[PDB]
Amino acid sequence: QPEVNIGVVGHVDHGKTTLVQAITGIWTSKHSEELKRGMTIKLGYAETNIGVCESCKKPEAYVTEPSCKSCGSDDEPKFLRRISFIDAPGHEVLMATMLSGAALMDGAILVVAANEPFPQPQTREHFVALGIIGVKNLIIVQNKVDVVSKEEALSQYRQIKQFTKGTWAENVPIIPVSALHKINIDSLIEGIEEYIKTPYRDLSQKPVMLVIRSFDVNKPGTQFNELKGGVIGGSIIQGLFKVDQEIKVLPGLRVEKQGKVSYEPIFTKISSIRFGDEEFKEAKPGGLVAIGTYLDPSLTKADNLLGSIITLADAEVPVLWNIRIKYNLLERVVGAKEMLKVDPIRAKETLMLSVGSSTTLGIVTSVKKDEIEVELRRPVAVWSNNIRTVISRQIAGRWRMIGWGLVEI
């Protein structure tokens, strides 16, 4: 399995996906046909091996396969770890899925375009979302250096070295790439091998995991007799799951009784485990996993339990409707082309509460200095007291990050 989850953030079309192509060799598909004409839309996914050419010279020593005869000589590169990416989209309004994604990440790579005016609306928006959430392991990258002057990718490296200054990003190193022709990527591999280090996760902890996809393996027309189970798609964060463990999802499906609303936990067994294209018997944090189940795929078709969280069956997790956020605000709206000042929060207003991987909306009942209580629509399964959350508003038709904080229970 992959050891660690790395984001690829940045502005729209700056080539976040193309840089996941040049490292993994895997494309996100670019799909929905509408993504095949737009660009990446659902969260991409791709894995690879990072060895190291011990018997040669760095950074070109940093391989992708067990093959060192590429650089210096043969001595089959000692394998260091296997990894996995999560490619967020770059378009301004697909803010609500990149946040969602960011509940799973152990580190990131900021893909700035060398041929556009540096602080681009989303490049920043993402960055401060990073600084907010706690993803303190960043590596900036200057992407399209194959279509610019040799003066131009330096003068921008000024602009990056000056923005990256008053912000927390000390020596966050800026490795210029060319995701297109896969030149100077092995030096990006040396960055990610040094700076984005493999954290320790205590396995004895309560099994908890997030979900960001889930799919009907059933092709148009698999017969009933070999109807494989439904498939939940997401990343473990704390613990390790095993093949043939009893499980529950939360908040889980809601019933209908004449206009009423009522969510409830669903139970099932782990039918199968798989990482990449290879099936496993256990699963551990870092990486996005997938869990074959025995529940009706109608329940997990398009991506129905998106935002849900998986835990042990017979575990202790509150399914809140109403919640106490301790919070703070950005002084600006780093997101809009325009930097208009974030107003102070008004009661009886609509806001988009990102908690974990779930992207709920909710209404504000109380407003203190830094303690607000939010009634919701679709519940939230609050697995701990250390639930980072992110707070957006509708400024002008398109949803915008404005404050953050922690969930209190």
Binding site: E34, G38, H91, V93, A396, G397, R398
Partner: protein, 83 residues
């Protein structure tokens, strides 16, 4: 959720007894819902109206209004032409 954008032609038209009408044409009939859009727009204009094939029609001159309401909803200011 989805996206989709289109070229929008707004102009004065003609109906029976009573005043002129306002045509809004050029929306993507797969992605965009002219029936949800139009219910919203009849509220802004405060006019009766319909979805007339692939168009919305609104009774009276509403041409500055609608462009001002369409751009709000996250449509492009540069795809819209009031004639």
């Amino acid at each position: 959720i989805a996206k989709e954008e289109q070229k929008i032609k707004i102009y004065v038209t003609k109906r029976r007894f009573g005043k002129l009408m306002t045509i809004i044409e050029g929306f993507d009939t797969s992605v965009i819902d002219l029936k949800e859009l139009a219910k919203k727009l009849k509220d802004i204009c405060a006019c009766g109206g319909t979805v007339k094939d692939n168009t919305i029609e609104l009774q009276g001159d509403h041409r500055k209004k609608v462009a001002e309401e369409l751009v709000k909803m996250g449509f492009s200011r540069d795809s819209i032409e009031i004639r």
